[PDB]
Design a protein around this ligand. Structure first.
Ligand SMILES: [Mg+2]
Lengths: 192, 195
């Protein structure tokens, strides 16, 4: 079983290309859910899956960004010790009252958040298209040719695996299958 | 060389001090309960000399655990009390945070209390159980010493089986065995074993 799923906010649930930090101003476009995020969240709410979002942006920037998910998921309490310390992830799991670490998963495209999850002892899922390793807005990503999007994904994928991340997928539309494969690995005895 | 340990967590009562968890028998603090458990001075010198980050964990009221921590408070951190108590992982995670631990990997909890050990297992830690001094034995030093050898062996064996049944990783008779116990866990880790 999965006691909880933790999600990055920007460059993960919303803000494709992690553009909200790129400015000190809020921007309406950035609160858009990333490809596959809406339906992944529908499924998680229907399942009753405990979930929380995690980010390091100032509340002024993260509040408008979280609006799309605030009906699905709490903001984890911010630690005094930030990423890559494990604290953020432990405090998220604690806010969700999880009974045990085993089976908890963090999903992000940000290496600093992913490292927090790795340090904390969670399973980790990296996102290949929408995080800061790619850093392109939706319109920018769409303007590339096929070969370019492939190159960008593959490059981010290897960077993420080099961190020690357990699985990398293109987008949150792949989350369900990704989690099912972690379940199979776990049944074979794999631990984070 | 073998993998190293970044931090060690210890129960206070029935583990570092208070053989037989006798602080649970009275609301007022008893100076006799602050006696360190057999082998503790030996284990703790090695750890303190090494600069091993260590914190203690308990659930007793402050009126009791503060006096109990007297023989270790020169150097060992008191873990902050969690809102959600054992067997929730919170007590152990909060202790690791208090030690500014950078990774869960290799962290160990030592206790004879099944509820605290369960917290450590839930928190994802390595666990070492104590067969003599914890609540499953629940006898004061005088009561423990009044038994015969056979009765002490029987009680250690019973506690040892219960702790392994919980899923604890290694069980030892007392803290004098901690160094060797840790060395064998490091060897297991070197062979790819995880908690
Ligand atoms: Mg591909």
């Amino acid at each position: 079983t999965f006691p909880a799923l933790l999600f990055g906010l920007s460059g993960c649930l919303v803000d494709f290309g992690a553009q909200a930090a790129t400015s000190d101003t809020p921007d309406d476009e950035h609160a858009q859910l990333t490809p596959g995020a809406q339906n992944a969240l529908k499924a998680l709410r229907d399942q009753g899956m405990p979930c929380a979002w995690i980010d390091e942006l100032p509340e002024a920037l993260s509040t408008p960004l979280a609006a799309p998910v605030n009906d699905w998921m709490i903001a984890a309490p911010r630690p005094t010790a930030g990423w890559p310390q494990p604290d953020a992830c432990w405090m998220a799991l604690m806010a969700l009252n999880v009974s045990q670490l085993e089976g908890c998963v963090l999903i992000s495209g940000d290496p600093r958040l992913l490292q927090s999850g790795l340090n904390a002892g969670l399973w980790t899922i990296g996102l290949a298209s929408c995080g800061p390793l790619c850093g392109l807005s939706p319109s920018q990503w769409q303007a590339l040719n096929n070969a370019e999007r492939e190159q960008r994904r593959a490059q981010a994928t290897l960077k993420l695996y080099s961190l020690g991340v357990h699985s990398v997928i293109d987008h949150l539309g792949e989350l369900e299958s990704c989690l099912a494969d972690i379940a199979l690995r776990r049944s074979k005895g794999e631990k984070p």
